[PDB]
């Protein structure tokens, strides 16, 4: 009864067997189908179990360990050893010489500074598959019991990984029996030409191209000498008296701006925020409603708490059983005004009380306008009236 | 003769007096006038005497204390007194509510979600002026001291400040005498409608509108809460569930890029690299040449160094006397190939020897080709030859 509260909720109805549902991140589904009980179902979660780095950016580095050759006017060509080490930034540039500084000549010497660049901070991209990723479902059978409406811990269901792959996932209903599941990772947005973006905490999907040409140190996805570093490297030789080097400062500011609020999938709980879909089918056969040998309760009933409507039009009552029958199905029919045809149908199929002071809930969907919510039986038999929106 | 060895050097010939000047970072000046002292100028530093604030911008961000006030379907409005405190950022949205969370009814609740905003980093700018800036000019006089050539140290010359307010600084050259100035700062770049960027240690000089228009928190020139906060803050809710608040993250690369080699004046050692110009004009009257009195060295010279050529077609050579006539000036002059006709002129006016064992550096102006360098008097007067570039 975990839908129940929910706005993006979707009613599906089973036939008389196979049930076609689609679950995405914020949407639940209700499903319906005669002699079987009525379930919720909500994607929970979306996990990538160690995908692949395209490719990894340094947004943010370090310049340390400067060193310079400096030549006289005559001597020729400067030449630092720093020059081999990836891992060092260099350049050329002439600076005056003469007597004044170790030369006996007067005229441009030559020099090449060179520092060493280290990342501080980066971000990976990532080559997704839905396929090999796994969801998480939950499933919630509408039991009625006392705190299952719209409870979002989880105790009141089942939780089912759907591996693409492994596949097939079959599940145990305690009490209920077995259902089953097959879905597919759908989604518009092509995948194979998208990539996920991953800055600490937040991540995107962005496209092949525009992340391969981003302006910004790189090392393959496959460290081992960063590529492009002078991206975030400076010289400056502004009076021909030395050269100077410097980096340009975090781009992760700058980045985000780039990532304007693209497709963001960022963080539920340091997890991902799955795109678009999930379109599965069900099987109930091998399931079973529960308590269909149940007597009727006789005795008579309280409402606990105060039927409530819900965003699709539905109401949600919570009563106590008060009889001395228990375990009992609850007699619950809605009619219309002259006292004689139903009008309303029940969400949370074959209402049962188990245990004497351990309320019910109990979801159903009246019609349009004037109605009657009978619970139980004469003597005592509740009697409520209710009006529907619209 | 700190000017010796530097390329952007400029040669100034006075009059018969004043002299006109032109100083910069980087360049070089050596002036000379006539039975007057040659002296090298130059442009040390800038100083700001702390001018003025127009703006100062947040370009990195915290974001914490969280806090939030969420209504029921039926209760209305969020209210938090954080939506007051101006260091707090807020957005309402609105949410699903029921039984699930604490709602009797169903619907849509509202809410609104506030976090104090705290700048990490910051950038300032400046309003300049030429005017009240103070310049510090460095003096050196061509006295042609053993260690003088190209001496970037300092103590060869006097260091004066030239106050655009305060006015007309004067100067004691020790032996010399006194000499005067009177500068005016001058420029291209209209500087009331342009600010010097703070970020740092570096600096540039950027226009007032685009400064302004830096789409960033930001305080008055005159924190006191930061002003336009959410153009680093974004508020988030995808399934109405809950909002999140994040910050954007250093902005700092973001802007270097923006500042790409603009007017850049970072830093000549946590010290400002004035734009453009220094025109002054110099009063040397009061000065007078050092020496002319001395006896004509009799002795015979010896070459410690080597004729070497500067950039501008003059020579330098340091001789040392071996005489016995000191203090005494020293017989030089430059001749041509038929052994008579004076054909080039000193830089290092009125060469003297002031010590036995102290040698001296004279600058000589040779003509084009082939010349003559005769130091001293016969007996074993030195006869140098000398051929000049192109
Ligand atoms: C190989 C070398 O140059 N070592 C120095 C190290 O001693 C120093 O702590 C560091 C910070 O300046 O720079 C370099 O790592
Ligand atoms: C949302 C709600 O009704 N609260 C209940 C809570 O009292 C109980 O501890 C838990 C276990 O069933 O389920 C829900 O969290
Ligand atoms: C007034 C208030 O909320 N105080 C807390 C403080 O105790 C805590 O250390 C900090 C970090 O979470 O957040 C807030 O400052
Ligand atoms: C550039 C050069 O010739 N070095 C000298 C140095 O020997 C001396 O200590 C100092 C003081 O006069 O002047 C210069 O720094």
Same mark, same amino acid.
């Given at each position: 009864?975990?839908?129940?509260?929910?706005?993006?909720?979707?009613?599906?109805?089973?036939?008389?067997?196979?049930?076609?549902?689609?679950?995405?991140?914020?949407?639940?589904?209700?499903?319906?189908?005669?002699?079987?009980?009525?379930?919720?179902?909500?994607?929970?979660?979306?996990?990538?179990?160690?995908?692949?780095?395209?490719?990894?950016?340094?947004?943010?580095?370090?310049?340390?360990?400067?060193?310079?050759?400096?030549?006289?006017?005559?001597?020729?060509?400067?030449?630092?050893?720093?020059?081999?080490?990836?891992?060092?930034?260099?350049? &050329? =540039?002439?600076?005056?010489?003469?007597? *004044? #500084?170790?030369? %006996?000549?007067? +005229? @441009?010497?030559?020099?090449? /500074?060179?520092?060493?660049?280290?990342?501080?901070?980066?971000?990976?991209?990532?080559?997704?598959?839905?396929?090999?990723?796994?969801?998480?479902?939950?499933?919630?059978? &509408? =039991?009625?019991?006392?705190?299952?409406? *719209? #409870?979002?811990? %989880?105790?009141? +269901? @089942?939780?089912?990984?759907? /591996?693409?792959?492994?596949?097939?996932?079959?599940?145990?209903?305690?009490?209920?029996?077995?259902?089953?599941?097959?879905?597919?990772?759908?989604?518009?947005?092509?995948?194979?030409?998208?990539?996920?973006?991953?800055?600490?905490?937040?991540?995107?999907?962005?496209?092949?191209?525009?992340?391969?040409?981003?302006?910004?140190?790189?090392?393959?996805?496959?460290?081992?000498?960063?590529?492009?570093?002078?991206?975030?490297?400076?010289?400056?030789?502004?009076?021909?008296?030395?050269?100077?080097?410097?980096?340009?400062?975090?781009?992760?500011?700058?980045?985000?701006?780039?990532?304007?609020?693209?497709?963001?999938?960022?963080?539920?709980?340091?997890?991902?925020?799955?795109?678009?879909?999930?379109?599965?089918?069900?099987?109930?056969?091998?399931?079973?409603?529960?308590?269909?040998?149940?007597?009727?309760?006789?005795?008579?009933?309280?409402?606990?708490?105060?039927?409530?409507?819900?965003?699709?039009?539905?109401?949600?009552?919570?009563?106590?059983?008060?009889?001395?029958?228990?375990?009992?199905?609850?007699?619950?029919?809605?009619?219309?005004?002259?006292?004689?045809?139903?009008?309303?149908?029940?969400?949370?199929?074959?209402?049962?009380?188990?245990?004497?002071?351990?309320?019910?809930?109990?979801?159903?969907?009246?019609?349009?306008?004037?109605?009657?919510?009978?619970?139980?039986?004469?003597?005592?038999?509740?009697?409520?009236?209710?009006?529907?929106?619209?």
């Amino acid at each position: 009864m975990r839908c129940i509260g929910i706005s993006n909720r979707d009613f599906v109805e089973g036939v008389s067997s196979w049930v076609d549902i689609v679950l995405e991140h914020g949407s639940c589904v209700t499903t319906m189908a005669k002699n079987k009980p009525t379930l919720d179902f909500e994607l929970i979660k979306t996990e990538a179990k160690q995908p692949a780095t395209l490719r990894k950016y340094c947004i943010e580095a370090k310049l340390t360990n400067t060193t310079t050759d400096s030549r006289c006017p005559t001597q020729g060509e400067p030449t630092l050893n720093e020059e081999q080490d990836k891992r060092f930034v260099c350049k &050329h =540039s002439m600076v005056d010489r003469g007597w *004044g #500084n170790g030369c %006996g000549l007067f +005229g @441009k010497g030559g020099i090449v /500074t060179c520092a060493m660049f280290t990342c501080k901070k980066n971000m990976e991209g990532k080559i997704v598959q839905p396929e090999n990723l796994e969801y998480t479902v939950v499933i919630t059978p &509408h =039991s009625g019991e006392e705190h299952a409406v *719209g #409870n979002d811990t %989880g105790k009141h +269901g @089942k939780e089912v990984k759907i /591996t693409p792959q492994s596949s097939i996932t079959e599940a145990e209903l305690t009490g209920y029996g077995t259902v089953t599941m097959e879905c597919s990772p759908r989604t518009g947005l092509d995948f194979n030409e998208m990539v996920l973006l991953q800055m600490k905490d937040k991540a995107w999907l962005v496209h092949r191209q525009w992340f391969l040409d981003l302006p910004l140190p790189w090392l393959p996805g496959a460290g081992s000498n960063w590529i492009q570093k002078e991206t975030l490297v400076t010289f400056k030789n502004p009076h021909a008296k030395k050269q100077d080097v410097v980096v340009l400062g975090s781009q992760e500011g700058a980045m985000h701006t780039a990532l304007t609020g693209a497709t963001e999938i960022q963080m539920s709980s340091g997890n991902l925020l799955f795109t678009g879909h999930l379109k599965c089918r069900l099987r109930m056969d091998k399931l079973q409603l529960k308590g269909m040998s149940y007597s009727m309760c006789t005795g008579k009933f309280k409402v606990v708490k105060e039927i409530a409507e819900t965003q699709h039009g539905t109401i949600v009552i919570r009563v106590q059983y008060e009889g001395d029958g228990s375990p009992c199905k609850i007699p619950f029919e809605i009619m219309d005004l002259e006292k004689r045809h139903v009008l309303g149908r029940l969400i949370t199929v074959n209402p049962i009380v188990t245990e004497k002071d351990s309320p019910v809930n109990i979801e159903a969907e009246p019609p349009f306008g004037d109605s009657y919510i009978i619970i139980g039986v004469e003597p005592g038999q509740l009697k409520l009236d209710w009006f529907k929106k619209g």
